[PDB]
Symmetry: D2
Subunit: 332 residues, 4 copies
């Protein structure tokens, strides 16, 4: 998975992510209403009451709705992404803290926080535990990112020595390794720019580029997390600034198209295909949720505020998994 957040020229904040995985667990956009209540653990029945409503992609087939990403009624946006070989969860809660399943952190944070400071507060009172789940069969190695309505972004990583928190980040996150490693890794590639190198001479040979794009020499094109991070990071820097929210979604999807994995190009050791199942964006100010699927290139939008936020039911919207082609003339 890959993600970033941009800030538009009309002071809107947006967050976007791609979901790469080897299977498609039953998913849909979930609107969770105020006061529905999210569990902390699958084996413990304590349920926290959520103050805020929120919208995002998630699963509704374990006790509480698990969200993969989403936006608040207060503008907090967040996502949980893979963090293989680095995520380490405790076996029993730390003293004075309550246990929490890694899969419920986005739901809980989105339901009760407004700010990145608040997120820092809340996770400080919990202990990510090694509790499994029936949708996967185990507690997945995760790391999380949040961006409030102001634009500030944080990265929370469950490291071996504990919860590591990164503040005022560049607003880019993919998978392992840790955030500090990738941020340092940026320094190796500051030569990657949009501008062409100067033509040089070898003897009497005048050497010139083949076309355009030669300033990018050095950028890796593979789909590892390190290469995905650099491409999102450098294309975030140099892509034109969005002037409004719809441009923001457009530009964000254009940036994530460089890290979009077609089916068949990346296989795991188990021989399974890891591909970009869906791509989504969200705007803090408007609280609109946008998504496109591997099979459908047309963007769909759901508005949080338009629903009844005191509903007693989860409001869900189904994936339209057909290429939504516009026929200009009665096409076969």
């Amino acid at each position: 998975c890959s993600s970033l957040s941009i800030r538009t020229t009309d002071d809107k904040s947006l967050f976007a992510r791609t979901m790469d995985f080897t299977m498609e667990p039953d998913s849909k956009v979930i609107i969770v209403p105020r006061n529905y209540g999210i569990r902390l653990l699958e084996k413990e029945n304590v349920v926290i009451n959520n103050s805020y409503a929120f919208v995002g992609m998630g699963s509704t087939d374990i006790t509480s709705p698990v969200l993969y990403d989403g936006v608040n009624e207060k503008g907090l946006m967040g996502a949980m992404l893979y963090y293989a070989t680095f995520a380490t969860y405790a076996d029993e809660p730390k003293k004075g803290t309550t246990g929490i399943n890694p899969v419920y952190v986005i739901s809980q944070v989105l339901g009760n926080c407004v700010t990145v400071d608040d997120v820092i507060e809340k996770l400080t009172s919990y202990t990510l535990l090694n509790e499994a789940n029936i949708i996967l069969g185990f507690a997945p190695p995760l790391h999380y990112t949040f961006t409030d309505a102001s634009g500030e972004s944080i990265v929370i990583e469950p490291d071996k020595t504990g919860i590591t928190i990164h503040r005022k980040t560049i607003g880019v996150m993919t998978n392992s390794p840790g955030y500090e490693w990738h941020q340092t890794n940026l320094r190796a590639y500051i030569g990657v720019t949009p501008n062409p190198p100067q033509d040089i001479m070898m003897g009497d040979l005048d050497l010139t580029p083949f076309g355009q794009g030669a300033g990018g020499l050095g950028l890796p094109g593979d789909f590892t997390p390190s290469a995905r991070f650099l491409r999102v990071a450098y294309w975030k820097k140099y892509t034109e600034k969005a002037k409004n929210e719809t441009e923001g979604v457009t530009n964000l999807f254009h940036i994530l198209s460089s890290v979009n994995i077609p089916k068949g190009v990346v296989l795991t050791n188990e021989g399974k295909t890891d591909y970009t199942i869906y791509t989504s964006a969200m705007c803090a100010q408007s609280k609109n949720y946008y998504f496109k699927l591997y099979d459908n290139s047309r963007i769909s939008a759901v508005s949080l505020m338009a629903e009844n936020l005191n509903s007693q039911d989860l409001i869900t919207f189904e994936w339209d998994r057909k290429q939504d082609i516009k026929q200009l003339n009665q096409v076969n």
Copy 2:
């Protein structure tokens, strides 16, 4: 520009291209009917009457429609891509050849040829002339690619020494340098694969990948013509086979997404942005023309056979430069 041709399990031939440029000329999807008549040169008041009807993206700013790509009523597909520093044209035609403006090649070929052999046979009796056009002010350096209903692709490059013909290519083409150069360059990247490398040990240290995608280490991520040829070539080899026409349109666009350029990340040395204006796809068997725009991610389709192929005028369809978002709710 990036382009490739794919074959479905359905026995369908599809061709797709990205249009990368620094300016957007007024372009539309044009249906030119039979016996419409296409010029050879802008200076000569002579038109050649065309036997076949065809659909594609082009311009109507000069005397005859200039098509950038398209499909004819017999299933021949083709496109003109940039070939900077290599395209070489003449001032006067070679004896026994007629002169042709480089910008009219697709229009003339689509209107009168059925097969890749006809293309080769017909281009042989012309000399690409140095005639400028009102739209850009000079004769663009171009190379051409064609794919017929059998799925055979050729490449035509107006080189220094003359027109070079490449029969039976791998169905991939970008920009300079010559096709043969790119085909040889493929051999250096043979180890770019979907599968992950085996873990290795260094002393007492276990070295394992950071996540997935490690098999592709070595592939370039810049937007030079040579890097883009590689990404389209290798992702074409490893993307799952398309089962039918619509899945083929979808896979083509996924492959081409890795060579999609966002506004700003590539600049000419005069500071102009070179981005992907549109992405198009065509099917030889159904004669459907599909496209999506920089600003609109939803695919639009035009059917060539639904129109009156004997019509006396051009049938044109205009661009919808607005993100065609589906509201699942009342979204703002």
Copy 3:
């Protein structure tokens, strides 16, 4: 700079390093004898009594003999390499410690310790000071590395958090950034091997590598600290094992030939050229010290055990800076 330890088949531990710099400080191979006495600070006359004698490369033109690297009578070797932008020093000594000019660390350590555990313990009671020197005009940002005769290497880093020590490393060290970052960076390159990739097909094309060596696709070839690290680490792993001390030295120099910088290929921001001034090697069990210059590819050896270790004078050998070519038949 670049360094690496290695272990022979005859149970020997050798160490080697390169010295890359923009200028040549008057240097020679200084032997320092038992109880000679080394300062700690330049603006402070306290001298500690070395109990051991050691050889290495160094300068003499400040109060005590500053050693760049070297071995001793107990088999301890180590080197000081650059660490730009990370190296942080204190202004006054941590209460319980004593100030030491960064440049005297090897001298001090080399004269008094026998093991990597000893070196930690010794360093434990010190506080690297910001005391400049007359040779450069400031205190160089540095990081240190030691290998004992057992074969264990350790990296010592004056980090902003404070001294960071890495025990049992892979025996590779280069410049910035920290040791952990480079060690993590190695996991992204595990596919870089000696073996060739399998041939593949694209359509009808058979694609074979051009010649040998296609297994290393992905390894960078630039002279940055990150790339030199990988090249040395991977080449250290796959280079055949040394059967003896002199086969060890030869192998060490073959590995460092991939990180050897000719004059002029690397320029600093000021305009100075950064090249490999010299390349040294050492054996812990024989205490032999080998080296070659940028202008002399012949290796010169110097034994510590032939010299009178109890002298009260610095036994120094000078550089033969002329290409030592062996004529087989007599001319110029």
Copy 4:
């Protein structure tokens, strides 16, 4: 194998090469005197009288001496390098020409030619043939390079379509593919320079290089024919100009250290180690022949003009394959 020529400030022409192979056949430096007689075919008994005397590395196992590289008394210098999967030979001589074994091309040219234009004329009356030889069992795939005293370089390549000659090349050559593929490949790596990239900001982050040598970002480090060509071509352009012959030799061996292959790091698909057996250098004006070996870092020189060039027998020098270490203190 990697090769290059260089001009000094002294007005001298030097040529150097690495010999990369999987076995070391019995090899020695050989002087072949005037009028000695060299065969064309190993099976046919026509010998050609050589007008000139020449030195170089080679073998005496088959009938005439076979030279891998060398310099003649008129300053012509040259070498035969591997051209796997491209070199195509004939079974029968084209009419009007004589058949010549591919392994005798250096000896025949050095013995009878002065100028690069002479070489071209000579070669026009021969037809390279598919005759094997006893040391290998088959005719090795090969391509050739020559530089005369004036410093003009040429590349000769026996391609499927006929003998391809390249005039006034950049004076760099390795293995496959063909010279024009490599020359065009240079244009993709034009941004590889000695200078560092400008620092950048990513939001609040100040992004800066780790150390030096960041301007080389994008240059490969593997030992394939194409990467070796890039490093030699680019390090040749930026390395300081050689002032005299001794600098020339030193400079040539520094450049070739970036393409020097330690044993074990490159394996063939048959498990054989491919490494750099010897590195040689030559000067057209002085006619000195210099070389170093895998196991011997010291340069040995042989002077052609210090011998009786009218001698009736070959004059040969054996490799001293012992590390020639200069003991400075009666070391062990």
